[model samples]
Target: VDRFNGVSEAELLTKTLPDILTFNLDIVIIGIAPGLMAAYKGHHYPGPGNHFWKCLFMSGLSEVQLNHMDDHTLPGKYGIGFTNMVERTTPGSKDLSSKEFREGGRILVQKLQKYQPRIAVFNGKCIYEIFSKEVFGVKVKNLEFGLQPHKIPDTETLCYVMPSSSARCAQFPRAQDKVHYYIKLKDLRDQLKGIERN
Candidate 1:
């Protein structure tokens, strides 16, 4: 149940994609790990019907609906950034172990401290849950999606939880429905940017 689309276990274990991160970004979108196809294609969210690009565009976070290959342009062009809680690649988030997530959370905290983005947007509730467990040492009660109250430890970066952009996501089956949260994300990012400018 691991390998799919011709990607092997060895490749998944060995290959890792680069994070599109930079200092002073408006926000950083965090996912759990790369899917098999994303790992093979060397991009983020390239799976068919995935709504990351469309939601990002329709929500006004980005001026253009970028292709998956254009992920590298985000930090420089739009002041947005991308990274994963787990740097490892997997066929699905379910394939990842809790230990890896715990370690990933630690590393992610370091990255946030180093780069100092204003907000960290978790693309799925599951990834956010893992992060909460690792960093807070307890589960957050009533863990609903959208902007979370907790910040990364010792940093000002806020956390926003969004519905998963995958086509397989049941709670948000339609891309149109999911764009509202991204729009909210856009508004919050703008507000943060405004505060910085003022």
Candidate 2:
């Protein structure tokens, strides 16, 4: 399968999606990498049937359901932000090389340290797996979904692992099941920010 399909080398070179981040954000949603459609469309999670936008709204993280095109507005509109474990675009995350993930992990740590978002919500467990091993040298055990005890070293940023929002994920086969975890994410933010939702 051709990863980029018909996309030209020039197009690919310029398609490294912008990082939507800022300091002191309430939540920063980190993904593994930009999928082919997302990279081509110049948006986050724009792939067909992707649950990212739906999950965010259903979880109450976003008061309104945001289209992928609106991703850049998140930091200012909702204090939610976006980034990824890897900046490289690929047909799918499975195409990513270990070296790419490692180097990306190092860069990600610098961004997290600088931004210090209250919580870094890893969109997929595998993203956290590479980050934890490469950054902290720990192979996690009983890696359950939702909040983990780990905090970004010497920072107030907490870690939360959620199943990938990709509709193809079988471990969490039901869309509602994924949204449930995202709701927990919303509650966690409210708890930390001392805000209550009725």
Candidate 3:
């Protein structure tokens, strides 16, 4: 994973966050990119405004309650991993250009290739769409939720796209709906155990 060396060490340290690329994990919760507040706090999904922690806590998907502070414990305790499509920071995802998405998609493919988690759960549909365009080299239309028809294309890895958990994202109504979705993730992970080796 070669990072862009455009920024100074101090600036680079601020912008470049680490990926939770742990092995023997069933899921990787991937995001589009970093945020201003999250990057400032030096943690993924750092802000309290995001429903990620709340949803996971409510879902019982974790071994214990997880907050933005528990990011370091994800891979080890819960068999979960985290990553971003792009390594850069933005106030809002819309601030990023399509070029960055495509480029990030390329980097993302490399990541999936390297880590090969059982499933990759996208925090939003847009990031999945960007990856489809970049990796499939064609526009994938009429996308749906849950297990996508696409895989990492040769590995055992799979993909799941959901609505963004950001405060601005209102498709799912409340944190309860998010908990339901994560329950689906938990169910899917458990179901995979039957066919995990294959």
Best by TM-score: 1
lDDT of 2 by residue, 19-48 (tens): 899986999999998876787878888866
What TM-score fits each model? 0.91, 0.90, 0.87
Error of 3 at 181 (Å): 1.8
**lDDT of model 2, residue 89:** 76
Each model's lDDT comes to 0.84, 0.85, 0.80
> What digit string (tens of lDDT, one per residue) describes model 3 on residues 1-198?
323334333453367567878777889988878776666667778766788888887877865667877888888888899999888876678878988888888888888888889999998888988887777665755987778877897688888987787877777767777777788888899889776566
Candidate 1 stretches with Cα past 4 Å from truth are 1-13
The C-alpha stretches of model 2 lying farther than 4 A from their native spots are 1-14, 195-198
Q: Which sequence of candidate numbers ranks them by lDDT, best first? A: 2, 1, 3
Give the CA lDDT, 0 to 100, for residue 9 in model 2: 52
Q: Comparing candidate 1 with candidate 2, which one achieves the higher TM-score?
A: 1
- How many clashing pairs per prediction, in order? 0, 0, 0
Q: How much lDDT does candidate 3 score? A: 0.80
Worst 10 residues of 2 by lDDT: 1-10
Backbone clashes counted, model 3: 0
